[PDB]
Amino acid sequence: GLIYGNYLHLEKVLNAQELQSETKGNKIHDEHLFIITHQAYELWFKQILWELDSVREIFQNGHVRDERNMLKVVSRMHRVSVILKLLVQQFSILETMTALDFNDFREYLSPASGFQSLQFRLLENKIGVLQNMRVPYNRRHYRDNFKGEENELLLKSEQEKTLLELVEAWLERTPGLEPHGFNFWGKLEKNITRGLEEEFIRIQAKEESEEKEEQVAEFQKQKEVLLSLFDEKRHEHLLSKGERRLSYRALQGALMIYFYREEPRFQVPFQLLTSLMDIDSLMTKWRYNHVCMVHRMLGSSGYHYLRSTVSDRYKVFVDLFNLSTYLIPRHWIPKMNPTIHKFLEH
Amino acid sequence: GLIYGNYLHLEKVLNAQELQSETKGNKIHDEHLFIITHQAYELWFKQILWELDSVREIFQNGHVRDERNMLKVVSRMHRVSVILKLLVQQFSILETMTALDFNDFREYLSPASGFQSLQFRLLENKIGVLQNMRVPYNRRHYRDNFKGEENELLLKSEQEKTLLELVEAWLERTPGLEPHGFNFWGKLEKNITRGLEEEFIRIQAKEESEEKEEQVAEFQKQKEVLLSLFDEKRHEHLLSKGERRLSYRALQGALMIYFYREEPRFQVPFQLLTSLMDIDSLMTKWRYNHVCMVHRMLGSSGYHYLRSTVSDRYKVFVDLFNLSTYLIPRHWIPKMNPTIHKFLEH
Amino acid sequence: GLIYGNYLHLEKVLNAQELQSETKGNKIHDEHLFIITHQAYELWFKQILWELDSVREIFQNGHVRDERNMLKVVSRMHRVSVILKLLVQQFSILETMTALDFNDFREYLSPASGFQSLQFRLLENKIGVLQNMRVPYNRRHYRDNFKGEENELLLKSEQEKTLLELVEAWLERTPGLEPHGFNFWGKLEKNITRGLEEEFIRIQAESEEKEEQVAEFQKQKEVLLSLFDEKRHEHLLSKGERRLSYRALQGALMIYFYREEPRFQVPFQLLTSLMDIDSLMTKWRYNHVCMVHRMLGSSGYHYLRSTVSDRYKVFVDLFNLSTYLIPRHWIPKMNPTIHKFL
Amino acid sequence: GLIYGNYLHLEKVLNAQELQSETKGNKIHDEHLFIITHQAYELWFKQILWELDSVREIFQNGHVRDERNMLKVVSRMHRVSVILKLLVQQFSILETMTALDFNDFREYLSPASGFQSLQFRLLENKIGVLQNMRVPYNRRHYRDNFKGEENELLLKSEQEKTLLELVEAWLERTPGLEPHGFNFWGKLEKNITRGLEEEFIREKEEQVAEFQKQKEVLLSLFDEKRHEHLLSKGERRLSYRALQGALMIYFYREEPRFQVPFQLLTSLMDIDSLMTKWRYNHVCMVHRMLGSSGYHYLRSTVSDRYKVFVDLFNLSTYLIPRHWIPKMNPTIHKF
C-alpha cells in the first residue's frame, strides 16, 4: 500500500539540498535556507504552470465556448493569484538572512542566477510577455542562457498560443458587439458624443468664473480621451508601440463585460478579467520584492535591469487596467432593456 | 560552471510529482495541487529542522555559554517563527480546492495520510512534545505507523535532548538566582509577602460592604496564586502530572529574565523566551488551520482527534505563557542595586 | 472645497484617544496601542455590519430573486471575509505588547471588557448566532450586560431576520427540487440506493482488505441514507445541531452537485463565502483566546475557549455537506432536455 | 464604573462616517468602505507617530545613553514595522471595490486627496524625508496644501530633530571609532589595503577587471571628501562618522553590546522598505482605479530619494571577507 513519503516522492524532494559551501569544505548555515527558498518557489511555479497550461488548453480546445467551464477557469486563475500572493510573502523568509551572512557563501554560487529559472521564463511566456517588449540583459536575449531541450521548451512557450492571445480571441467573440445586434460600440459612441455635448452646454451656462475655466479645460481633456476610444487607427498605432496589446475588438469585448458585468452571462467573465489583472499586479509585486531584496543583499547592474522589469512593459493585461481611463457616467451606458437582456441571461 | 537547476537539484525536485489518479488512468487536475502543497510543507519542515537542530547543538555543546552566540540563537528561532507564519498562510492555497473536487481523487490516496510525515513528528519531538501526553489516534502510538530508519530516527528524536530540555538547562544557570548572590527568589518571596500584608491592612480598614467582600475574595485568590509560586512540592507534583514542564529552578530563571528583561544581559534572553512562546503558538495555529480544512474536506473521528491536538497538552513552553499569572506590581520587584547591576553587563 | 480631514471627520476619529492611565496621573505608553487597536476593530466591525445589512436587505426585499444581483451579493460577502482576514492579522499588532507592560495599565480598565462590544454582538446576531445556543457567561445571558437603546438594538438584531434565515428562504426556492420537475432528491435517493448495492456486489467478490472494505461501506451506507430521514433532521434541528430546513439543505446540495451549471456558478460561490465567514469568525475567536492567554494567564479564557465551537458556526450545515459526497457518476445526470432551466 | 464604548470614545469614532454621495442625495454603497479604510489608516498613523515620537524622545533626552533602554527602543521600532506590514495588507480590502463602482462617487470627493494626510506627512518628516529632495507634484510644494495649526505642526516636524538625525548622533558615539582606542577605521583601511594587494598578487583579465572594480568601491569608503560631497547632494544622509559607527555595528554585531543595536539598524531599514511598499501598493491601486500623472508622480515616490536610511542598505556594497575584519580579541572586546 501507498505511504505519504512515497506518494510525494520525498526521496527526491528531501535529498535535493547540496550546500556548495559544504561541498567545498566551508559549510555556511544560511546557504541551506537559500536553497530551500528557491526550491519552494520552483515547486509553486510548477503548480502555477500546471494551472495556467490547463486554462490555456480550455481556451485552445474551444471548451471555454461551453460556459459551464467558466467556473473552472476563474477558480484556477484565482488559485494562481492566491499562490502568487504567497510567493510574495515568501520573501519575508529570506529577509531573515543578513547580507553579511549571505556574503559568506555567495562566492560558491557563481556563476549561477535566478535568471536561469526555466519555469519563471515559461511562466512569463505562457502568460504573454512578448520578446520585443523585453528589456535585454547585458545586451543579450534571455534564451541565449539556455540550451538543449530547455531551449526547445522555451521556444514552444514562445511559439504556442499565450493566455493573452487566447483571451483576446475569446474577448473578440463577446456577445453584444454585433452591429446587427446590440451594436454596443455604435450606441456607446453616440451616447458619449451626446453626453459630452450635454456637459459642454452645462459648463457654458456656468457664470464666468475660474472654476468654470478649470471645468472647461477638464472637459477638453476628457472629451479628447473619451473620443480617442473610437479611433481604431490610434489603437493600431499604440499597438505597434506596445503601449497596448489587445486587438481593438478584444478591447470592445472587455469594456462590454465591464459595463454589463451584473448581467448573468458576464458575472463570471468579469471575475476572470479581475483575476487576470490580479495576476499582473502580483507578478509585478513579485518583481518589486525581488528587486528590494537584491538591493539589500548586493547593493546598487542587475539591480537596474531588475528595476526596469517593474514596468507596464511586463504587464500583459495592461489594457484591462487602462479601461479605467474610459469610465463614463452610468446613465451614458447603452440601456440593456428586458427586450435586449435575453441574449445575456442563460 | 554551476547552473541554477543543478545547484538546486531541480532534476529531483521538479520530477517528484506523480498523480496517483493519473497512474491509475483517471487523472484529476486538483491532485497536482495537493501534491505540491505537501511537498512545499515538507521542504519548509526540513528547513525548520535545520534551524532547530542548529540551535539545539549550540546549547548541547555549550556555545550558548558564550553570549556572542545569543544573537544567532534568537535570529534562527525568529526565522522558525517566520517560516511557521508562512506555513499557516499556505493553507489558503489548498482552500482553493473544493471538497467536491478533492473527493474525485481521495480514493487513490488510501491508505496514506499526513500522519506519516516523519518530519512533522521529528519537529514535534525535537521541540519537546512528550509522548506521555500525546493523544492516541484510534488506539495507536504515533510511531507504530513508521518502520525502518524512519522508526530509528524518530526514536533518536525522542531520546536526544529536546529544545525544552536544553533551554531548561540554560535557564537553571540564569544569573541572579544564587542565594548567596542577588537571591532573587528570597527577595521576591519577602517583597510579595510584605506587599500582600500591606494590602490586607488597607482592606481590613475598610468598612463592611459588598465591595469589601469582593475585594477580600479577590485578595485571597491573588495571595493564593502568588504564594503558590514558592511551593516547590506543588510544582514537583504538577511536573509529574505533566501540567508543567520546566524544573522549579528553570522557572526561577525564566521569571528572573521576565522581570529584569531591560537589563542588557537579559535583553536578548527575553527575546528568546518570547520566540519560544511564538513557536508554540504558531505550531498550534498550524494544527488549527489543518483541522479547519480537514473538516471542510471530509466533514465530521480524524477531525475530533485533530481538534484534540489543539490543546495545552501539546504546548511545550506552557510554563513561559503561564508566568503572566504571577505578575506583581513593578514596585514589588526586587530592586537591582548599582553594585548588583554590574553582574548584568558585558 | 472639501478637505480630506473633514470628509473623514478626523476631528472625531483622531480625538478619541484618552489614556485612562494618563487620566489617573500615571500614563502608560502601551495603553495607547490598546486603545487604537480596539478602535480599528470597531471601525471594521461597522463596515462589516454595513456590508452584511446591505446583503440582508437584498434578500429581505426579494431583489435576490433577480439574478443580476448575485454578483453584488457575492462581492460584498467576499469583502466581509477579506476584512475578517485582516482583523485576524491585526492581532499581530497587539502581540507586540508584553503581558508585563499590559499589567501596568490593566487596573485602569476595570470594569470594562471587549464583551461590551455592541457591534460584535450585532454581528453575531445578524449572521445568525442563536441565543438559546449561546454559552452562558457567569451563568447569565450575554444581553444582561447591556442597557438602554443598546439592549433594544440587540433585541431587534435577534428578532429581525438573520442572514441564515434569509439564505434558508432563498435556498428553499432553489430550482430542481420540484418533484414534478428534475426531482433531484428522488433521483438522488434512487441513484445512491443503486450505487451502494453495486458496491456491495463488488465487495462480495474473504481477505483482510474485504473486512476493511465492508466496514467502510456500512458506515457510508448509514450516512448516505441518513440524508433522507427528514425526521432525524427535524430532530437534530430542534437540538440545534443543524440550522437549515430540510428543504434548504436540498437546495444547497443541489447547488453543490450542479455548481458548474451557469445558474449555479455564483450561488455556489455564495455558499463558499458563507462558510468562509464562519471560518474566519472562528479564527478571530481562536486568535483572541490565544492572546488573552498570553496576557492574563491561566477564566474568561475558558468561557472564550468554549466559544470556539460548532455552537457558534451558523452555516455548519454547509460544511457538513462534505459528509454526503458521492462518486460523480452517482449524481443525477442534468437532463440536456431541460438543461436550459439551469 | 467604566464602559468599553466610553473608554474608546466610540460616540466619536462610530459617528464619523458621512457619505458625501448621501449628503448630496445619491448614496453610493462603496463610499462607506472608502471612508472607513482611510479612517483606519489614520488611526494607525496616529499610533505610529505615538511610537516614533516616543523613540525620538528617548534619543533627544539622552535616555538611549543608558543601554537598558535599547530593548524598549527596538520593540517600539519593531512595532512600527508590524503596523506598517498591516497597512500594506489593508489595501487588499479596498481592492474589493471596482473602478466602476468607485467611479460612482469619485465626483463627490473633489477636490480632496490622500495628499492632504497631515499625519502621513508628519510621519515622512519625523523619520527624516528631506523637503528639498521631495518630488514636486504639479510644480508645487507639499505644505502649500496645508494651512493653520496644520502648517505649523508640519513646520515643527521639519525643524525638530528627525529620527535619522538622532540616530546619526547616536551612531557617532559608537564605541570603537576612537583612534586612540580600537582604531577601527585605520585597522580596516590597513586590512583592506593589505588583502587587496594580496589578491592582485594572485578570465584572469575579467577577474582583474572585477578586482579593479572591487578595489575602487572598497577604497571609496575612505574618501571622506567624496562622502561630504555626496552628503551635500543628498545622495547620502549620514555623517561620515555615523557611517563608521554603523559599519562597526555591522561587523561586530555578535558582540553583546552591539546585538540589539544591530537589531535597531535592521528595523530602520525595514521601516524604509515597508514605507516604500506602502507607496507602491498605493500606486498599483490608483492605476486600477483612475488609469492615466498621479500614477507617475506616485511611481516617482518609489525612488531612493525617499529612503531615509539608504546608507544602511548600501553598507552591503562595502563587504569584505570575514578574515579581513579587524580581530576583536577579548582584551580589546572588553568595551
Ligand code: HEM
Ligand atoms: C539573496 C537573494 C537573491 C539575490 C541576491 C538575487 C540576485 C539576482 C540578480 C542579481 C538577478 C539579475 C541577474 C544576474 O545578474 O544574475 C536576479 C534575477 C532573478 N532572480 Fe534573483 N536573487 C535572489 C533571490 C531570488 C529568489 C528567491 C528567486 C526565486 C526564484 C529569484 C529568482 C530570480 C529570477 C527569476 C531572476 C530573473 C528575473 C528577470 O529576468 O526578470 N531570485 N536575481
Ligand code: HEM
Ligand atoms: C485535503 C487536505 C487534507 C486532508 C483532507 C487531511 C486529512 C487529514 C486527516 C483526516 C488527518 C488525521 C489522521 C488520519 O485520519 O489519517 C490528518 C492528519 C495530519 N495531516 Fe492532514 N489533511 C490535509 C492536508 C494536510 C496538509 C496540507 C498537511 C501538511 C503537512 C497535512 C499534514 C498532516 C499531519 C502532519 C497530520 C498528523 C497530525 C497529528 O497527528 O497531530 N495534512 N490529515
Ligand code: HEM
Ligand atoms: C489585552 C488584550 C485583550 C485582553 C486581555 C482581553 C480580555 C478579554 C477577556 C478576559 C474576555 C472575556 C470577558 C471578560 O472576562 O471580560 C474578552 C472577551 C472579548 N474580547 Fe477581549 N481581550 C483583549 C483584546 C481584545 C481585542 C483587541 C478585541 C477586539 C475587539 C476584543 C474583543 C473582545 C470581545 C468581543 C469579547 C467578547 C467575546 C465573546 O463573548 O465571545 N478583545 N476579552
Ligand code: HEM
Ligand atoms: C480609491 C483609492 C485611492 C485613490 C484613487 C487614490 C488616489 C490618489 C492620487 C491620485 C494621489 C496623488 C495625489 C492627487 O492626485 O491628489 C494620491 C495620493 C495619496 N494617497 Fe491616495 N488614493 C486612494 C486610496 C488611498 C488610501 C487608502 C490611502 C490611505 C490613507 C491614501 C493615501 C494617499 C497619500 C498619503 C497620498 C499622498 C502620497 C504622496 O504624496 O506620496 N490613498 N491618492
Ligand SMILES: c1ccc2c(-c3ccc4c(c3)nnn4CCN3CCNCC3)c[nH]c2c1
Ligand atoms: C541560485 C544560485 C544563485 C542565485 C542568485 C544570485 C545571482 C547573482 C549573484 C548572487 C546570487 N550572488 N552574487 N551575485 C553576483 C551578481 N552578478 C552575477 C551575474 N553577473 C552580474 C551580477 C539568485 N538566485 C540564485 C539561485
Ligand SMILES: c1ccc2c(-c3ccc4c(c3)nnn4CCN3CCNCC3)c[nH]c2c1
Ligand atoms: C498525502 C496523502 C494523503 C493525505 C491526507 C489524507 C488523510 C486521510 C484521508 C484522506 C487524505 N482522504 N481520505 N482520508 C480518510 C480519513 N480516514 C482515514 C483513517 N480512518 C479515519 C479517517 C492528508 N494529507 C495527505 C498527504
Ligand SMILES: c1ccc2c(-c3ccc4c(c3)nnn4CCN3CCNCC3)c[nH]c2c1
Ligand atoms: C477596552 C477595555 C477593556 C478591554 C478588555 C479586557 C477585559 C477583561 C480584562 C482585561 C481587559 N484585563 N483584565 N481583564 C480581567 C478579566 N476578568 C476578571 C474577572 N472579572 C471579569 C473580568 C478587552 N478589550 C477591552 C477593551
Ligand SMILES: c1ccc2c(-c3ccc4c(c3)nnn4CCN3CCNCC3)c[nH]c2c1
Ligand atoms: C478622501 C478623498 C479622496 C481621496 C483620494 C483621491 C485623490 C485624487 C483623486 C481621487 C481620489 N479620485 N480621483 N482623483 C483625481 C486625481 N487628480 C486630482 C488632482 N489633479 C490630478 C489628479 C485618495 N484618498 C482620498 C481620501
Ligand SMILES: C[C@](N)(Cc1c[nH]c2ccccc12)C(=O)O
Ligand atoms: C460562446 C462564447 N462563450 C461567447 C463568448 C466569448 N466571450 C464571452 C464573454 C462573456 C460571455 C460570452 C462570451 C465563445 O465563443 O467562447
Ligand SMILES: C[C@](N)(Cc1c[nH]c2ccccc12)C(=O)O
Ligand atoms: C554563562 C551562561 N550563558 C549564563 C546564563 C544562563 N542562562 C542565562 C540567561 C540570561 C543571561 C545569562 C544566562 C550559561 O551558564 O550558559
Ligand SMILES: C[C@](N)(Cc1c[nH]c2ccccc12)C(=O)O
Ligand atoms: C428566481 C430565484 N432567484 C430562484 C433561486 C432561488 N435560489 C436559487 C439558487 C440558485 C439559482 C437560482 C435560485 C428566486 O426564486 O429567488
Ligand SMILES: C[C@](N)(Cc1c[nH]c2ccccc12)C(=O)O
Ligand atoms: C554610551 C552610549 N550608549 C554609546 C553608544 C552610542 N551608540 C552605540 C551603539 C552601540 C553601543 C554603544 C553605543 C551613548 O553615548 O549613548
